[model samples]
Target: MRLSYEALEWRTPIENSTEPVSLPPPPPFFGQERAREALELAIRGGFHAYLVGPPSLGKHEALLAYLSTQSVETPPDLLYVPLSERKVAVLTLPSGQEIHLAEAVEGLFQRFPQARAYLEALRARYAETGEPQWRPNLLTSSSSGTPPPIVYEPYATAPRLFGRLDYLVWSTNVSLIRPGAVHRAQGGYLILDALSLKREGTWEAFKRALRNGQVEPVTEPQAPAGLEVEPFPIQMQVILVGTPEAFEGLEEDPAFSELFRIRAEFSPTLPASPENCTALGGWLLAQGFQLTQGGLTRLYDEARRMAEQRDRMDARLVEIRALAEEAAVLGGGLLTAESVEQAIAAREHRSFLSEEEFLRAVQEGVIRLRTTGRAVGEVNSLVVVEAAPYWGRPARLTARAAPGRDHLISIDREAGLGGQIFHKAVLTLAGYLRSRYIEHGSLPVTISLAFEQNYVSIEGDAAGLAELVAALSAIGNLPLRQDLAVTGAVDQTGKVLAVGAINAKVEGFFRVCKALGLSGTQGVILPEANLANLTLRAEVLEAVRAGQFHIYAVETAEQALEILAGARMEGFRGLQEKIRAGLEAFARLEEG
Candidate 1:
């Protein structure tokens, strides 16, 4: 029997469109008024500026927007030189003009009749001698206009930013000098990554150039030293963009701090207000797309979620644009709230496999995480694991503490599975114990802590509260409720500090309970200061609303302990008393 299959017609949802849709122009700059003003002021004053902010905050876009607003007819001379690693030559023309050697060679005959004559005679001599001769070709025509202004982003490299010389030895000695980024950007704006400049060891040479307003061509010591090439005068403005961490790295370098006098900061978030939303919505609509009001609202919600602040929306125009583009494509021209949600879901789905595998392990008992019951010396902690860009999920942090001599040991730290921040957090636990419980006396007990079966390296102090709670539970022989997971950093005075990834951390624990079964008593305890950071998924939020899961925000370790232990912590004084009593009991046993 022969069977005929019907032809499958593949069609996109967008109708009457013959060509691929052009991506929308960048969204209008919104919500960074102060940063824009500062950048404009710096440019107008010709002062070097450093834009510091977190990634994705539209630092580069803000500058681009400002550039666009300026008059095009009398545009400022701007030359944009992207980061290039290629080498080029530096040369001085017989006309007393200094430029890159490659540029000079390109216009050799047009600019210098003498050099053209010399090259022609040399080529003729080489042809008679039957020797290999190489000479730059003369241009057929050339314009005698001033070189346009330039912008240079050298990125991070010493050789790329500083010109180098090549030596050739034959019957006659020859040398070729190559120009770097600083050379190409002599008379315009130079934009650079501050961190890259420091890392590539280009700061000293760059500073010298900026200080003297000249490009001092650097050549090898062995290559015929006395070329008598005059330094090229530089009339340029510089803009350095980097994160606060990068700024901190360059802060101690006096040359860097001295050169960049103006500072502009791009905020990661802006107030989530109707005016800003409408402005952004208009920008989106201008891109030949349509969005429902509900879709716009969802976009705003997602932006707030990205900012990790309930009261503010993220100003990351790049991410927002990308998301809008994706939603438009998925929606086939009209963006509905469901389409935006789908875009977000698709993004999370792509990056959530790691988190899924982790949860699967817990479900399969491969990774032992208790979702019910109580245990001594063990407390459930919440940790946020970044699976990919803009996607993070929660992991179970099970900390165990045991009695020992007068020392505290972190298994992850000893195993080299903890980062510097995690190590510091562990040490801070020791400080807290010494100051709060072991006052005026030597610590008589040893405590050890570990993230139960956590194979991946651990970083950040977000788990400090849990680690402390576990140690105290062991010290006091108190059993902490396993139904709850805690996340927050703790200081020496027992104050709980706000932590990041609050939503992910909360949802992570909730998922574990959901996998097992929510008992209405299961919940997460986090720092009270992080309450404003909660922008949880609808499922988790619904669970909270239904009383199937709970979220408690506390300002002190005592408050967290009270929730986990189901008793008044008495300002942590009660726990301290129990810890001291246990220590005395242990000491007496040792003496006996």
Candidate 2:
């Protein structure tokens, strides 16, 4: 989808003079209803909201649009403070004296004229003497006597409330101070860009703030002098945007699970159905210098094709907008479908220095697939989606069997034992093997597995059921049906439980397998718990329905084992019976 700059022949940027415009209702799969629900809850609960999702999911844009409805001819005061490690000291500044720094510097002067005057006077004095002047300038004399502490005094700071400002936006950096997002976004909307990278400090800080609505001040010299006083009455509403991993991580974290009780979900992309696509394409055209009917359909199709290739649509929008403008400059007519195609083709040649470097890396085999000496039970597959710098690398698929495998996977890094899933999967497999195979004085079976070339940590028991299948396959020398890929949580009894990123996991494996080679038997087996959340991209679901791919929903571990291991997982009936057997087996093994 290319944008024709020439098409935007309007005298200036399209600025609506009327009240803030309402964004077109999001199409199906866009999760407009979920956002609406969150907004309603935020207003009713008298608390701010946290928008959470993955990259390219449109959380920021969606939230802005939603808030626009509450806007009027005279806009309400809204402040979006893009914070970083540098701004951590904002709260530490003295009372009655605003910090004249960052974006807030200008706004601070306007809001509190006295503070602004002091800052201006300080600047003038320094300019005149070419040195620091410790004495009070005219502006400083206004607040005569004791100068307020840079840090706030709790009881005295209560009245400094910003007066329930309409919104205070903050986009937190993942690499900042350890205390977490709560410290920066206290008393307002904590808008996070990529939430999946929830740093440990950020997570803990978030939890503490939620529990107390007040942050305990950090002891950096730059920070406030005393325990940082709560600057304003804190009413936090956090919005985090990232990939499915963000939500999946939160869902698994015990600390965050209950805290983020409300979630406003978003679709990965807009659909390409005729009506919806037409409307979207029209909107895109309207934003351009020219809106031509011919270009409308073409841009829509281009976006759809890009979405198919990328497994995401937002990227397509970016590509099209740029291309359209280029095409318009080169031609005199309104952008047509023909021009849009030209722009897309041209994008291939429009490589920047970064792209050149990435391409070089791809050519050098630095990122090449390494499949030699891989585990027999694992397969190497490359998934080519719409991501830029398309290249495939070898990924190890192994059955994880170590210690502590039964524990639920937690994504919240702040919580204890959150990264235990990797260990749990291993232990769970060990328990399964010990209980079922070694009971009859048989030799103890040992199985080990790991993701190859996975330099970074891999969490989530979404692959728990998969590990179980692979372990059983190795032990039983049972060949996994090449047609199937599986994911879900499994207990010792072999009961399958729901896992997250159901859609992404399925699509990731499917695309990889398809790239390598497609077979009529390709399918995915998932837990039934994912039924209510079956909101996958229409294109993927259509493929499953059309028999291009398949999906199976199972509940019990036995059922999953049957599908994966091609045999029943032997087990005692009933939870009590299983527990008794497990205890006895542990006692006997340890006693001996």
Candidate 3:
């Protein structure tokens, strides 16, 4: 059945204009309710979590924002005793050591004034250690109560992660001892990127620190002697953030597995709902683009394009922000829909060179693609061009079959130019043909398939319908329409399954048809299951509305046959009858 123009694009909720009002503190990372919930739970439990997601879902931002709400657990002060002439006290901490002074402990001294015995015990322990000059290192102070801080350490080296001692000569001119990320985030949390931590020796050192629960000055090779100091115990959660590849090999390690048990995953894609799309607008507004309603709609439309799905958007908030910023800069003020369009078109023009060259070759007759005629044993299939940028190109797939030979082959498969999935797709097509005609055993034909002019190795079975239909057309000796390109995978039962790049396939083929001057018959046959994937170009939709181009949705091979080869109408057995005749003519006729 042909799809209407309305099915080709989604009408965003705020279609007319943007709501001009005072914006709140830019909306939360809109689609991350569950991820954030899981992360918050991990934080409260003090469990190490891996904030896993694509590049920019604003996960770091999400963590920081979520942490602020959890400021109830105030961080203690890193108070160290000074060697001042106060009352005689043997309880001064060592020359380079400090202690965590809890706010409640300080409050108890003011309110209760009854910790004399406790103070006496601490003094006896200090004297037992035989320490004298108290360490005056005032690392941090909570003058006013402050929430635990999250220190995101970019440099994951040993010295950067653990504390370091600065001294020209150890045990003598000990200048100053500085703490690292692990030490700084003692009472709170620490975030480390998986990228840097995965470096050689870095991860091992970190694991050691985590296992020991302490941070000390990294050993210096040039030091004449070691400094007399104690390792400060740290109580902070470590969070690692990165993509899937960034966590490879690290997952197999037992230390890493126990340390980072929970993963707050940011999905690569989010649903392209009206609510999420609008929320995305609030995000762009926060990024300095006060968009009009039209601008919001345009950005929403771009979101669909980025995801290549009408109902989904990628976690590419960074890319969206970049585009919005570019458009705002170009507009010099409030960005309208036109400014967005200008930004989008400009981006396309920059990425357009290679895609245009391929299409130009098709139009100039350098690459032969027929859209005005019919041919037996051949059909148009859409292929994605990955040699450079993203775009789709139409390829002609041809099939031939002859009687009394029981074998099937794809030249592309034989030449090692097809992927494993693509090879299996051909084998499945062979399975499908036997399942299609003969009820029991293998088919009585030697069939061959090939992608005309295809050189590089290709993957995916998105063109399974085209291959199956082309073979059927060859076997039945029926002419298949060249004007319509077909996409979608086919099962053994001839069920047309949805494929990727549906919109690009439709748009690419549509542009080719338009270049050749659109016959009213030029169109595309795709899976009905992919109706939700139709975020077609405006020009393609316009032509579909004008009846110059069409998009047919097919569910099964029989429907594809009816649409592409004009089969199954006469006595409702036309093509299948032909297939049966060919099988019977070459068979051991009686039921064996």
Candidate 4:
């Protein structure tokens, strides 16, 4: 049966609304109450804070919103300054005194206006002279009024961030010192992008400025040497916006930790409570758009899927705003659920090429993956391949065990192809074996795992369960069902733990099995705790309902073992005894 668009269409609260309806006010800041409170406190306390989160979390917008509410009869000296490569001038006097020409010009205007006026008259006199003559003409002041707080984003360079001195040439050469973001932001707030600032190597200078409460001109090594300007005292609050990883990297430096005492952590997702939805609706209205109740619900569903958290919705305002705009365009002057779905589908379509190719590789046997039958020392371990801004594909994980040293080794770790988390996962496997079987004696087995032709670095412990199951299959000389793919973290006690990207992992394996033509026996085993996180596609759901595939939510390794081995192997207790018996038998044979 063909599905009609209307069947999936959402009902709007406002029917036949006027075209190009007035947009609502900026959405109420939702889901970030803690961050907002922390930021507000930091600002009130007159200190620096870092807003760390993934992009589209409205960190910058939240800051602006906070500022807007403040009484600014005389606004704080604020300026959003971009990184500048402009040069400045350096002037040397006969007395060996030097200063920036820009500063000198300002000084001349303020302290020696008569001299400037006299110099201008002298230049006019020289212009009429029949003979060649020279006169100083400091330019008239072009700037007026009090400077406010500034927000500066500078390219990574000491000179651009602090300040610079450049040569101004006309009839006479005069040096002018150009102020940088730090200089302009003095006595105000300066907002910086943490990653860019770090990349530009401006953090050291920035830290020094923060410590000293002042900024000094940094002369470029390539430029002619000149007298350095006296440092100007600054009293400004710096707000850094970047990912948590970037912030953590900065925190590694002792100085950064000391300076950025306040942290406002913006979560990428927030609980999808009624308050949040209302705030989001208000925000949409502010953007000159509205979503009907059904459309709004659909939007929230998409958000939950994006967040990949059952109780949370994606708080990426940037993406939401972009989606709203796209949906409105598709709806012909109205935002509808259909438009949102279309936007989501289009985005996925655009990003599905890489994922499609990977799946095709599995189908063609270019990438070896089994969806049927069973094998000793082999289990289908699921992994997510993030081709981000597009899709994440699931690939097969394979393991093999052999009689060797006491170490349960990870080939990927040994080869340096494993990430920190992957290494930890391998260690966890060793931990599990020792805790469960060491009392009986040492597990005299070496197990190695591979990602089945994966050349990229493998990270995360999501495959911990599969790795352990594979190891168990080898140790006991038992074969696990190859048709079943497994994903989850395993504790030393054999209890399965939840893992990230559960939905993607499950779907990935399901997709491969579907391609291979799923049998009633084919299925995936996931942590029971992750059942709430399952927002599977309709096709996969339909397949499950039709018994074309199966999804087993196992709470413990014992259940998983029963399913894979087709026997009631009661957790590690049963497996431990088997391995112990094998070890004792091997010991006797060695003695002979």
Candidate 5:
């Protein structure tokens, strides 16, 4: 008989959470190379470079830090323009001199007494000859009888410090002008923060300016008052920063394809090298806060754990700082490890309380953990065995197979979004199982998969890959390699995709694994798409290099499966077909 395969649709109510998840820690700076590369790219390409990532990825800090450490002479003057209510406010110097929106333009000088003496002389010459014949000064002369009209100068004029106002201020509406922020930022470094929030119209305008090296005024009657002015020369490098999605969205715009040729990522934490974390801690200590030896150890451990959980050591550093601050506040003294732990727990409690829906999901077994379906035959496959009852149906746990799967077990969850994490745990496990057994192979037995001891509908896809592994193990009648843990999402195509809360995922897994008695071979596998995203806990990274714990980045299912399974699955497509046929036969058996 010719074997045939048919797709099986499991009837299950997939629960999705409606709660917002906690934001992960910042990404790592990695080194100065990224910053320099970005800067150089901007200069060479003549296109403004935008640095994109998730929150606290240190977009601004990295650029600022790079500029601060460089020995370049005559660094460009920094002008910060804040956009609000469709208006722009030019940040003023601390000298109590406020430049109103109108008076802060590039060339127009208003009366400021001693500041306009030279300008008054120049105006007199211009009045006589209809040409700018006199040198401009900061002083305004009341002696000149001719009243100067409030004027706005083009941004292309020779650069000079205008007393307390070194920068010009125009509304974002200025994007409508031929000479806008693109023009204003010329000959200097222009930093665009939160560019992710820009509207499509503004983005289009900005993109046009970057590409054409000139901005065209909009044709609308009320387009912008600034557009009547001449096109100003813009020779500045642009830095755009925002969340990852925002960056990706911008990249999707064909017009912006080559706009930003260089990319620099910031991870959440750094390895606990004697030099980096210790130095960071010492630096933090110098900032007037104290850390006890025990506290230091705790912080280090937390960093390590975070690194393991989030796959980014930098996460640990950020968490340590945050927890340290809370600990100091609660202890009424220097922070101790005990205090830090307490602070962490308290913070977690606070988060849980705020997340009523998530808490409920955890208690209901809507999410539960399963420990079966681990072993080699399950390579690149997830076994979904019926776990226990969750919200309604029996919960399921996913297991994957591995050559070193035992060494790479890990659970990565979002930190505060309990509902989402729980939901993700279930779906991810389910998705993994479906892909593996249904799409990958026929296992030894029917394995049950579920998130045990979880009450709420979890959120996030960060742990999807890990849960899939667990379920696959059960179905394959294989044991998980105790030393390795994995996280991420498994698509229908069996590819491992990127997920959010990466730092927290690594840290959380690290902590649990460490508590469970980590073997020297303990490590975690994550999506290689998250490489620029890795800022694992500093200590965890160190441990990884030390053979205590490690992080492996897998780009595709094959890679992940090969890493987990000791041997490659030959004729994977054929195996999938066989599995599909077996399931059909089973269904026919049931029908008979």
Candidate 6:
């Protein structure tokens, strides 16, 4: 099936907005509804939450926003009294009265008579000698009533996250001390970046503090034998917001499982429903940009583009905001679709140097890629470069078949360019060829396949179908169209399977074709399952609209053969039979 221009994208649902219109309050949390739900329950229950999601989805903002909607609680005065060995920490009501150590000591010495009498004499002597008692360290306090502390720590360090004891005059004197994120958020909430917790002592400090329910202030160098302030009891709700790079390993032990009981996971993409569109649209408007209908619609297109799917938009509210902001300024506060396009074009061009260089090389015939020919054993295979601002580039894969006991050999594997999945694709492609085309006999042909002009290692089975077709064309002496680039993997049953980055692959091939001058027949053949993933640039869309370009979605290898060979499967089957006859002749000739 071929897609028309109208089938390329979904129009904005706000079609009635023939003019600029105000939107209702956008829904909360960027379609991370489940995470919101988990947060709501966790907040009420006072559980520490671990928020996991891709960055730029506003996890931090959404969590804070939700916390703000709830009423604030008055925190108790957090205080600590240091003894020679350990410090005693407690929470008390806010009051002007100071704690007298004499009376407290008088009460504490009640268990033993000698110690009591000794303390009594010592206290009397101290009063007689005019020595004052030690005063309590006011860790945190409030006079009337104030909101609970919600602290966000940028750097997750041990001393910064858990309070530190600053010493003066030989480092043993208790002179200066400061509260930390754990101390500042004593009765409220603490937001931490899980990525930053990878420091040497931070995670251990955090885990120990929370588990023992106290964060003991540490002094530089050793105290040797001085006074020790008790560990400040950890009482804050911690939320670690970051990627899985720092989490999956942290999820293994008792420390991780014990402290973070609640999990809030944000989705990378949200369903492109009318409600989500309106919510996001309303949010875009809230960012101070008044827009035309087309301008507003372009925001949805940008979201869909970020998601790489037409039916689901990305959860990257932050990136969308930036795009809208750039477009807004580019249009002098009134955004149009053209302004949006210009803004997008500017951003992409900044990162487009690599793509342009490769395409330039292709254009100058420095790297030979055909847009107007057919080759028997060679086909254009799609591969996405794994770089920042990643893109798709076509690689040439060729196969050679000869009569032997071997099945298939991948040059990618021998050259160390085949990742685990790529190796799997090569094996699977060979199996499909034998199962579907070859008769019930020992596979007669030894087929070897490889990619051309490919230096980087390859991963994923996205190019499996191309390899399969190339092998089939080689063994059957069939020349497939080089004008059509192929993506999608093939199963054992000859069913074409979907792949990721379908949009990028399609665009990559089109850009190369456009560079070489489209012959009106240049196109991409992909899995039919990826049509939901098809949302292309206006340049490609216009070429398709003009009947100068094409995209074919096929469900089976034979369907693709029809598109490539311009004929039914019977011709390809006849070619497959000729291979069998050649193999039989070889077997008879080789048999002594």
Q: Which has the greatest TM-score?
A: 6
- Cα lDDT over the full model 3: 0.73
Residue pairs with colliding backbones in model 6 are none
* Higher-TM-score candidate of 1 and 2: 1
Error of 6 at 574 (Å): 5.5
Cα-based lDDT for every prediction: 0.66, 0.45, 0.73, 0.66, 0.45, 0.76
Better of 5 and 6 by TM-score: 6
The sequence of per-residue lDDT tens digits that candidate 5 reaches over residues 7-84 is 111111112212211222222344334555666566466566666655654456556644443332222222223232
Please write out the lDDT profile of model 3 over residues 1-592, one tens digit for every residue. Answer: 8898777756454445644523444445568766777787787798888988888667787777766655534454452232231211112222122233334334333332332323333334436777542223455534322456778887788888876766653442222556678766766778999989877468887887788754545667777755444333556888898888889868889888888988788877788776776687677776667778787788778888777777788777777777878778767777768788798878778888887787788878888889978899899999878754467778899998776556778889899998988887888888888766765266777778889989898899887888988887877777989999989898877899989888878888987887778889899999999988788877887888888898999899679878888667357467777766666654553234
Looking at model 6, residue 114 earns an lDDT score of: 22
- TM-score list, all predictions: 0.68, 0.39, 0.86, 0.71, 0.45, 0.88
Per-candidate RMSD vs. true structure?
Answer: 11.4, 17.1, 5.7, 8.6, 16.0, 4.4
Off by over 4 Å in 4: 1-29, 73-188, 195-237, 245-261, 326-333, 389-457, 474-479, 570-592
Worst 10 residues of 2 by lDDT: 133-142
Task: Quote model 5's TM-score.
Answer: 0.45
Off by over 4 Å in 5: 1-47, 69-187, 194-201, 208-227, 309-312, 315-319, 352-592
Q: Which structure among the candidates has the greatest lDDT?
A: 6
Give me the displacement of residue 498 in model 4, in angstroms.
2.6
| Alpha-carbon deviation at 559 in model 4, angstroms | 1.2
Worst 10 residues of 6 by lDDT: 111-120
Could you tell me the lDDT of residue 215 within candidate 2?
A: 48
lDDT of 6 by residue, 186-303 (tens): 6678999887887544788788788776576656656554455555456678888887666886887677978898889899999987778778768877767787777878888788
Kindly report which residue stretches of model 3 are placed more than 4 angstroms away from their true locations once superposed: 13-22, 72-74, 79-135, 169-175, 387-389, 439-441, 569-573, 584-592
- Local lDDT at 436 for model 5: 54
Q: After TM-score superposition, what is the CA distance of residue 396 in candidate 2 from its true location, in Å?
A: 5.0
